[PDB]
Write a protein that binds this ligand. Structure first.
Ligand SMILES: Nc1cccc2c1C(=O)N([C@H]1CCC(=O)NC1=O)C2=O
Ligand SMILES: Nc1cccc2c1C(=O)N([C@H]1CCC(=O)NC1=O)C2=O
Ligand SMILES: Nc1cccc2c1C(=O)N([C@H]1CCC(=O)NC1=O)C2=O
Ligand SMILES: [Zn+2]
Ligand SMILES: [Zn+2]
Ligand SMILES: [Zn+2]
Lengths: 90, 91, 90
C-alpha cells in the first residue's frame, strides 16, 4: 500500500488507504514525513475554498505537493494533501 | 472503496478505508464534500461523550449524517463521522 | 481489517487501513476507544520531534500504546499512535 518519495525512495509519504475523491494530483486525507514551507496561499488554488502550502519530503526536500487547508470551518475535510503522482513511487 | 451520496450519485462522502467500530449508522474517521449546518449539540447524542453537528452533501444538500466532536480531551478519536447507511451507495 | 484489544476482545483500537511507516510497535494515523493517561513527555521519545502520552483501552484499562504528538507545527502527521502489537488481536 505504501507511496514513497520517488527521489529518496525509502521515505513513505502516504498510503493508498488515504486516497479520497474531492471533485496528475492525488488527494489523500493523511500523509507523513513532509515539511511545510511558508504560509498558506489561495492564489490559483486548484481547490476552491482551500489554501495551499508547499510540502516537501523531510529527507531529501523533493517537492512532493501541497497541504490544502479549508478557509471556512463548515467544509470537510478541514485539510488534505494534494500530491503530484509522478513524485511518488508506485 | 467509494461511498457516494445516494441522491446526487456523483459526490464521494467517505471510503471503506475510513470505516472503524466505535461501539444503521456507519462510523468513519474521515469524510469529504459535507457541509456542516449549525453548532455542536450533545442533546440525545447517540455516542456519549460526543456532540453532533448535522452534515449534508455539499452538492445536493441531502442530510447524510453528523460530525461527532469529543467533549473531553482524553477520548479517542477526538472527531469522527456518523453516516446514515441508507443515504449512501454501495452497501 | 479490525485490530482489537487482546484482553477484552471486543473493543476495536485501530484498523489495518490506518497503518503507515514513519521510519513490536505498530504506527497508525487513527485509533479509537483509548483513554489518555497524563500529559505528553519527550523523555526517551522513540520518535524525535514527538512527545508521548500513555494510551489504554477504555473498557479494560490494558495499556495498548501511546499517542504521539508533534512538538512543532511543520511536521506531518501532527499526531499518530504507536501501539504494542502483542496487545492487539489480529
Ligand atoms: N509552479 C508554480 C509557479 C508559480 C505559481 C504556482 C506554481 C504552482 O505550482 N502553483 C500551484 C500551487 C498549488 C495550487 O493549488 N495551485 C497552483 O497553481 C502556483 O500557484
Ligand atoms: N430528527 C431529529 C429531530 C429532533 C432531534 C434530533 C433528530 C435527530 O436525528 N437527532 C440526532 C442527532 C445526532 C445524534 O447523535 N442523536 C440524535 O438523536 C436529534 O437529536
Ligand atoms: N516502561 C517505562 C518505564 C519508564 C519510562 C518509560 C517506559 C516506557 O515504556 N517508555 C516509553 C514511552 C514511549 C516512548 O516514546 N519512549 C519510551 O521509552 C518510557 O519512557
Ligand atoms: Zn525524499
Ligand atoms: Zn448529494
Ligand atoms: Zn480492552
Amino acid at each position: 500500500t505504501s507511496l514513497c518519495c520517488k527521489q529518496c525512495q525509502e521515505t513513505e509519504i502516504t498510503t493508498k488507504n488515504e486516497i479520497f475523491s474531492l471533485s496528475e494530483t492525488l488527494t489523500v486525507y493523511k500523509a507523513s514525513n513532509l515539511n511545510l514551507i511558508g504560509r498558506p496561499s489561495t492564489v490559483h488554488s486548484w481547490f476552491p475554498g482551500y489554501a495551499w502550502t508547499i510540502a516537501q519530503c523531510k529527507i531529501c526536500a523533493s517537492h512532493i505537493g501541497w497541504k490544502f487547508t479549508a478557509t471556512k470551518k463548515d467544509m470537510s475535510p478541514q485539510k488534505f494533501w494534494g500530491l503530484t503522482r509522478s513524485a511518488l513511487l508506485p
